[PDB]
Amino acid sequence: PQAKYRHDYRAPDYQITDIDLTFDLDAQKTVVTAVSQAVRHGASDAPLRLNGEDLKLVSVHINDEPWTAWKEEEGALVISNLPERFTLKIINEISPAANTALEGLYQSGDALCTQCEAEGFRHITYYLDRPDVLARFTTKIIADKIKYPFLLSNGNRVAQGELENGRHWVQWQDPFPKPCYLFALVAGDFDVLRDTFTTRSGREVALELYVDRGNLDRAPWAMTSLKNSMKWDEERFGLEYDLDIYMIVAVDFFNMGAMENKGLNIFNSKYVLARTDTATDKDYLDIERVIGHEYFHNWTGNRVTCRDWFQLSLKEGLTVFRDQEFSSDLGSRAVNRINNVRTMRGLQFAEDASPMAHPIRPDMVIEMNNFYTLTVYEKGAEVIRMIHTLLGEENFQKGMQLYFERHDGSAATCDDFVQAMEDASNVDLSHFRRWYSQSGTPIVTVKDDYNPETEQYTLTISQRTPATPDQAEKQPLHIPFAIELYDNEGKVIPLQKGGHPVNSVLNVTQAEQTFVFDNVYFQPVPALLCEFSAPVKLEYKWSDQQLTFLMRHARNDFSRWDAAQSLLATYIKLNVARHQQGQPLSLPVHVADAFRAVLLDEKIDPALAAEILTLPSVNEMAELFDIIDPIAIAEVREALTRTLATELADELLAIYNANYQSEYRVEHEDIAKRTLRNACLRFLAFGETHLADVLVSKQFHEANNMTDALAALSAAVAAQLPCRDALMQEYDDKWHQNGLVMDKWFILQATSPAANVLETVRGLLQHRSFTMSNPNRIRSLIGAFAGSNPAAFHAEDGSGYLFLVEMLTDLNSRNPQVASRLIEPLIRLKRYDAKRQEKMRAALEQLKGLENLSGDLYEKITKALA
Ligand SMILES: COc1ccc(C[C@H](N)C(=O)O)cc1
Ligand SMILES: [Zn+2]
């Protein structure tokens, strides 16, 4: 498979302006008729090159003339000797039932549905399957009425009819030109939740949520969240919905989360269905965020689209920024910020050190579906947030407005977006643009000096980015570096210099620079990189007491949590070294006392307290280390939990009890209290065994919501408590028919600390609730093993690697997109010791040798083995 390069972009030789589709739908054989209106822009001698995959061509006509000047080639239909303007008619056949890759038109249970992003429309018909070709669609769907009573496409219904033999049809039209990746079709039998939203200006929009029969009891939160998204986008961004109907369809078989198809979003049912007995607080907030995200794409992705796929972050960084701002405004901003920074530092930084490292605007891609990444998404959003930090809200919104003014109805680039922000704000972003083209994580080193004679405080700040596997050359970035300086009473020292205030966002633009601040009347405790102001590693030689000071005094909740993380990081490192030497956990008394203080502080928001009391995950821990020792990290995480459980036992139990709530509500204050209570229960579970067993089994049985029941269950598994097997079996017996609920259980199984975990996981491939045909089940059993139990996955015997190879041998043929997500933990081999690295290399070499290796895996394996 040959790579494609960003620098190779050229405008298309032909455009399509209008496409009329007809589908004669049947799961074994669907016939597609596509009538396109095309215009040649290039040279008269250049052929029309259409993309297509696994299509059976029936006929090709040009202005109703059966055409002879064409040829099929790999991936393509090449049509020669065309007029400047013409009607193209293609008829072709496709097989939805055969589509196990879930790309194009496929089956989800008994429903037929589509996934077209990035390049799935070419699995439906021969087309210009590139996002700078925007066309007006009309879609006619013909099908069996009993099997497919609902026939859905983008837009509004324009025509409807009934035919003989029990067939009927519906035709849709969407007035807004779109790239084909935003085409959708759904056919099936559903329950339908119907509601309305009226826009600020008075447009009434019909809201329709399509769910499998018998799932309406699980649909109201998603509808609520849709309406909240619509309202928020009006309030915050000034953006209203632009069509008459908003349809969402929840499907059980879907490789990703959800898809922003215009007016007809298609969602993984995981990100729609919730009721208090089936879904946790986190599930509710994820549904909220994903419903928001897809809605927000209506402007940032649909009304303004991407010129080419290398501009994916244009829509995805910006839409993730918007989903984060939505969740943060409606809920806890500090909890959101903290979790997004957890993701950045613990997952995204690992990608940016890996063989798959790329800038947020990639330069080279083999399989575009491989570039829907933590980088493009989460680091993309940090890049947008940095523009917000440099511009401020008012100017950022001026930029958004200029962006839409300029680019509405078109496909644009990252550069276009940055230009709009520059022009609207008058802030120069020329240097800042390097964030789009340079990969890797910057390391920012800070030294300080306080001169009591002059009352000056000097920060010496340096930056460098290590070379990455993709780029041997690195240059300094424009790093917005926010600070705050605290005196001895915990008061903020005004920043100034030469008689003038100094903005607290320092512009760190050089490899090394100094910043001097005057009238600094007391040696400061600095808070550095406030609200994680740039996506960088910070190196500052913190004392423990500076960190516990910030935990008590810092004005922003984020900085209190970040200080806590720095305090723990020293001790995590210490204790992984100790584990390697066979020595027990060591923790200073003063460190435990800091966490005691957080537990007993009546002033602190319980939402913040819960996050300070949630230890970094094994993935966050691994980023502290050049070479990862995954057994040490897992065992130190457990031992640190057990140490704090012993040292804080009375305080944990008192806070656990104080935060008991007898009413369950999905409301942010209630969620906060519950997250704190359950953070205490986690430590209590690793305390004295009989008390732990009693507390956990009682919570499990007495819980009136899944949040609390799962928190107990998860604690029983993590602490290997006596009640574990009984509780695990009770859950299975109650919920085995409900795959989304069983996914939680599969995750618990795959992440168990138990010595025979892999044997249990392999046995669960035969479980009644497991199937290799369903991406969510795969993710929850196999993905969770490989990605979230790096201790068992990295068992010294190599057994974890071999297991994954067998699963990937299946999945390469069945569903390469899922396979490619699942290979990720093997491509991180260079972070492990030599013996592990040799085993992981041999696993990659076995996969490189598969017959019919997918492009998706080929790209990752070749980079990993370089
Ligand atoms: C291969 O199938 C998909 C690829 C991408 C997505 C993400 C969606 N655009 C979003 O950003 O939510 C969805 C599906
Ligand atoms: Zn998106």
Question: What CATH number has the domain bearing residue 15?
Answer: 2.60.40.1730
For the chain, the domain total comes to 5
Alpha-helix residue ranges (DSSP H) falling in 73-177: none
Q: Looking at the structure, do residues 321 and 410 belong to the same domain, yes or no?
A: yes
Q: Which 3 state secondary structure label does DSSP give 241?
A: coil
| The two structure tokens encoding residue 711 | 């928190």
On whether residue 5 sits in a domain, the answer given is: no
Please tell me the residue having the least CA distance from ligand 1 atom 10. Answer: 259
- CA of 180: how far to CAs of 94, 261, 612, 762, in Å? 17, 9, 45, 40
Residue 294 falls in the annotated catalytic set: yes
CB 361 within 8 A of CB 311: yes
On the CB side of 589, CA atoms within 13 Å amount to 0
Q: What is the DSSP string of 398-438?
A: HHHHHHHHHHTTEEE-HHHHHHHHHHHHT---TTTTHHHH-
- The Cα 527–Cα 484 span in angstroms is 5
Instruction: Say which residue the tokens 């499998």 belong to.
Output: 212
Strand ranges in 554-660 using DSSP code E only, listed in sequence order:
none
Longest dimension (CA), the chain: 96
Please give the helix or strand (H or E) that residue 330 lies within, else none. helix 312-330
Choosing from 53, 181, 256, 287 the residue with most ligand 1 atoms within 8 A of its CB, the one to mutate for a pocket test is 256
Tell me the C-alpha distance between 302 and 325, whole Å.
Answer: 19
Question: For residue 251, what is the domain's CATH number?
Answer: 3.30.2010.30
Residue 674, amino acid: R
Task: Name the residue of 259, 272, 375 to mutate for ligand 1: max ligand atoms within 8 A of Cβ.
Answer: 259
Of 312, 417, 415, 326, the closest CA to residue 373 belongs to 312
Task: Find the 117 Cα to ligand 1 centroid distance in Å.
Answer: 6
Do the Cβ atoms of 656 and 680 come closer than 8 Å?
Answer: yes
Residues 617 and 601 in one domain: yes
Report if residue 1 sits inside a domain. Answer: no
Q: What is the CATH number of the domain that holds 514?
A: 2.60.40.1840
CATH number of the domain to which 353 belongs: 1.10.390.10
- Residue at which a domain ends, from 500, 516, 541: 541
* Dihedral sign (CA 793, 798, 801, 802): negative
Distance between CA atoms of residues 345 and 375, nearest Å: 11
Whether residue 344 sits in one domain with residue 463: no
- Same domain assignment for residues 389 and 522: no
| Minimal-distance CA residue to ligand 1 atom 5 | 117
Asked if residues 481 and 529 have their Cβ atoms less than 8 Å apart, the reply is yes
Q: Distance between CA 679 and CA 688 in Å, rounded?
A: 17
Tell me, in angstroms, the distance from the centre of ligand 1 to residue 255's CA.
8
Instruction: Assess whether the C-beta atom of 257 lies below 6 angstroms from ligand 1.
Output: yes
Whether residue 729 is found in the same domain as residue 581: yes
Considering the candidates 103, 119, 288, 294, report the single residue annotated as catalytic: 294
Q: C-alpha 113: how far from its chain's center?
A: 22
Domain-located, residue 6: no
What pairing do the DSSP bridges indicate for beta strands 48-51 and 456-464?
Answer: unpaired
Same-domain check for residues 569 and 640: yes
820 lines ligand 1 (CB under 6 A): no
What values do phi and psi take at 540, rounded to 5? -140, 140
Do 345 and 446 sit in the same domain of this protein?
A: no
> How many CA atoms within 13 Å lie on the side-chain side of 241?
29
* Whether residues 211 and 166 fall in one domain: no
193: enclosing H helix or E strand? strand 191-198
Q: Is residue 639 part of a domain?
A: yes
The rounded distance, in Å, linking the Cα atoms of 538 and 639 is: 27
- Per the domain annotation, does 3 fall within a domain? no
| Spatial distance between the Cα atoms of 481 and 502, rounded to a whole number of angstroms | 13
Rounded CA-CA distance 183/121 in Å is: 8
Q: Whose CA is nearest to atom 7 of ligand 1?
A: 259
Question: Same domain, yes or no, for 445 and 434?
Answer: no
For atom 14 of ligand 1, the residue with the nearest CA is 256
Q: Residues near 685 by Cβ (< 8 Å), separated by ≥ 6? A: 645, 692, 695, 696, 715, 716, 718, 719, 721
CA angle 213, 214, 219 (to 5 degrees): 95
Looking at the structure, do residues 727 and 774 belong to the same domain, yes or no? yes
In angstroms and rounded to an integer, the radius of gyration of the C-alpha atoms of the chain is 28
Same domain, yes or no: 445 and 431 = no
> Which residue range(s) make up the domain with 530?
440-541
Looking at the CA of 290, which ligand is closest?
A: 1
Which residue is listed with tokens 């002879």?
68
**CA–CA separation, 580 and 573 (whole Å):** 11
Report d(CA 781, CA 758) in Å as an integer.
11
- 260 carries a ligand binding annotation: yes
As a dihedral over the C-alpha atoms of residue 299, residue 303, residue 306, residue 307, rounded to 10 degrees, the angle is -150
- For 348, residues 6+ apart whose C-beta sits below 8 A from its C-beta are 374, 375, 378, 379, 535
Residue 2 in any domain: the answer is no
229 touches 292 (CB < 8 A): yes
In a domain, 296, yes or no: yes
Same domain? 596 vs 677: yes
Spell out the SS3 assignment of 573-588. Answer: HHHHHHHHCCCCCCCC
The verdict on whether residue 293 carries a ligand-binding annotation is: yes
Of 541, 561, 589, the residue that ends a domain is: 541
Q: Reported resolution in A? A: 1.6
DSSP state of 44: T
Domain boundary among 404, 422, 439: 439
CATH assignment at residue 688 = 1.25.50.10
